[PDB]
Design a protein around this ligand. Structure first.
Ligand SMILES: CC(=O)N[C@@H]1[C@@H](O)[C@H](O[C@@H]2O[C@H](CO)[C@@H](O[C@@H]3O[C@H](CO)[C@@H](O[C@@H]4O[C@H](CO)[C@@H](O)[C@H](O)[C@H]4NC(C)=O)[C@H](O)[C@H]3NC(C)=O)[C@H](O)[C@H]2NC(C)=O)[C@@H](CO)O[C@@H]1O
Ligand code: NAG
Length: 361
C-alpha cells in the first residue's frame, strides 16, 4: 500500500507553531513524500523559493533514517499558470528542453522522481499532456541505462468529471505514469453561493444534479476510463473549507456571503488547517452528513466543512475494498504535525489514521 504525502514550500513562513520544515516529518509515516512546487525557467525545471536547495536537502536526509522512502519534486501547482505549461508543451523545441533538464536536476538534489501538477489542461491541451507524459517517461527510461535506478514519474489529476474529459487522455497516460493521484477534495467551493462539502465520499440521495461530485463516482469513472487500480491513488484532505454564512440557515443548502475568515496561522480566506480546526471546534456545533459520511461544524456565522479521524479512516477502507494502490494526502503541514492542538498527544493524527487502515487487513 502506497502513502503519498505532499509537503508545501510556503509552509515555512507560517508563524509560531504554524511553522513547518521537512524536519517535522516523521520518516516512517509515508512511503513517498512529494515536495511542492518547482518552477520552470528558461524552459528548464528550477527552484521556487530562495532556500529551496536547503529544504530539498533537509527532506532528502530523511532517507538516512529510512532507506526505503522515496521522494519526488512536483512542477506546476495552482499559483503557476496553466498557460505557461501549455506554452512549453505544444512547441517541440521547448518541451524537449524542459524534458532534458529534469534527470540532471533531480539527481543533483537527490529526488527519486517528478510529479506533474499541471492544473488544468484545456480541451486544446489534451494532445499535448499526453506527449509530455510520453516523452518524459522515455527520457527517464533512457537515463536508467547509465546504471541508476529509474526515476519515477507521476501526475496529479483533478477529479471533476468535466475537467477529466476536457483534458486528460486517461487510457494513454496511465501506461506511462507510475501512479496517478486523484484530487478528490475539490467538489465544492465558495464559487457556489451555498454551503456544501468538498470531499463527500458518497453521493447521498439528497440532491441529484451533481451525482458526479464525490470520491466514489470519480474513482469509478477513472476505472472505466482505463486507469488500472494498481496505479490510482485517492486523495484525502487534511484541511477544511470555511464559509461566512449569509443568514441563520445552517442546514444543507444554506446561503453564503463568501469564504470564511482566515485562520490565525494559515492566513487564507476559505481554508483552515486541521490544527486550526481542532481549536475552532471548541464551542462549535458538531454536525455530520450521514448519507455522504463527512462532517461539518458551525459557530457564530462561520460554517466549516472538514475531515476527521472517522471520515478519513472511512475513505481509507473505501480505497482498500476497491483495491486501489493507496492514498495521497494534501498536505502534511496542514495536519497536526506537532501533535499538540488536537487533544490526544499524537502527531499527524489524520495521516496516522489513514496508515492504520492501510496497514491492516
Ligand atoms: C489547502 C491549502 O493548503 N491551500 C494551498 C494554498 O494555500 C496555496 O497557496 C499560497 O497562498 C499564500 C497566500 O495565501 C502564499 O504565501 C507566501 O509565500 C511567499 C513566498 O513565495 C512569501 O514571500 C515571503 O515573505 C517573507 C516575509 O515574511 C520574505 O522573507 C520572503 O522573501 C517573501 N518572498 C519574496 C522575497 O518574494 C510570503 O511571505 C508568504 N505569505 C503568505 C501569504 O503566507 C503562497 O505563496 C501561495 N502559494 C503559491 C505557490 O503561490 C496553494 C499553492 O499554490 O496550494 C493551495 O491551494
Ligand atoms: C519562476 O519562473 C518564472 C519564469 O522565469 C519567473 O518568471 C519567476 O520569477 C519565478 N517565480 C518565482 C516566485 O520564483
Amino acid at each position: 500500500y502506497k502513502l503519498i504525502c505532499y509537503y508545501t514550500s510556503w509552509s515555512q513562513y507560517r508563524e509560531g507553531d504554524g511553522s513547518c520544515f521537512p524536519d517535522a516529518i516523521d520518516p516512517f509515516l509515508c512511503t513517498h513524500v512529494i515536495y511542492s512546487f518547482a518552477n520552470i525557467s528558461n524552459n528548464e525545471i528550477d527552484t521556487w523559493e530562495w532556500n529551496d536547495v536547503t529544504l530539498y536537502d533537509t527532506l532528502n536526509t530523511l532517507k538516512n533514517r529510512n532507506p526505503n522512502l522515496k521522494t519526488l519534486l512536483s512542477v506546476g501547482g495552482w499559483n503557476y499558470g496553466s498557460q505557461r505549461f501549455s506554452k512549453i508543451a505544444s512547441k517541440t523545441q521547448s518541451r524537449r528542453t524542459f524534458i532534458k533538464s529534469v534527470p540532471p536536476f533531480l539527481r543533483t538534489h537527490g529526488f527519486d522522481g517528478l510529479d506533474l501538477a499541471w492544473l488544468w489542461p484545456g480541451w486544446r491541451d489534451k494532445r499535448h499532456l499526453t506527449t509530455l507524459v510520453k516523452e518524459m517517461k522515455a527520457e527517464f527510461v533512457r537515463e536508467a541505462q547509465a546504471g541508476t535506478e529509474q526515476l519515477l514519474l507521476s501526475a496529479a489529476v483533478t477529479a471533476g468529471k468535466i475537467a477529466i474529459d476536457r483534458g486528460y487522455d486517461i487510457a494513454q497516460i496511465s501506461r506511462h505514469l507510475d501512479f496517478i493521484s486523484l484530487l478528490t477534495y475539490d467538489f465544492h467551493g465558495a464559487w457556489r453561493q451555498t454551503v456544501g462539502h468538498h470531499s463527500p465520499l458518497f453521493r447521498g440521495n439528497e440532491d441529484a444534479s451533481s451525482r458526479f461530485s464525490n470520491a466514489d463516482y470519480a474513482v469509478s469513472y477513472m476505472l472505466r476510463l482505463g486507469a488500472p487500480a494498481n496505479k490510482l491513488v485517492m486523495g484525502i484532505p487534511t484541511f477544511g473549507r470555511s464559509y461566512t454564512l449569509a443568514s441563520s440557515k445552517t442546514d444543507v443548502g444554506a446561503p453564503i456571503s463568501g469564504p470564511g475568515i482566515p485562520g490565525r496561522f494559515t492566513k487564507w480566506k476559505g481554508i483552515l488547517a486541521y490544527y486550526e480546526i481542532c481549536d475552532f471546534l471548541h464551542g462549535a456545533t458538531t454536525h455530520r452528513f450521514r448519507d455522504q459520511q463527512v462532517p461539518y461544524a458551525t459557530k457564530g456565522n462561520q460554517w466549516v466543512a472538514y475531515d476527521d479521524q472517522e471520515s478519513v479512516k472511512n475513505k481509507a477502507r473505501y480505497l482498500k475494498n476497491r483495491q486501489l494502490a493507496g492514498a495521497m494526502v494534501w498536505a502534511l503541514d496542514l495536519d497536526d504535525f506537532r501533535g499538540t492542538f488536537c487533544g490526544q498527544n499524537l502527531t499527524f493524527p489524520l495521516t496516522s489514521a489513514i496508515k492504520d487502515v492501510l496497514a491492516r487487513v
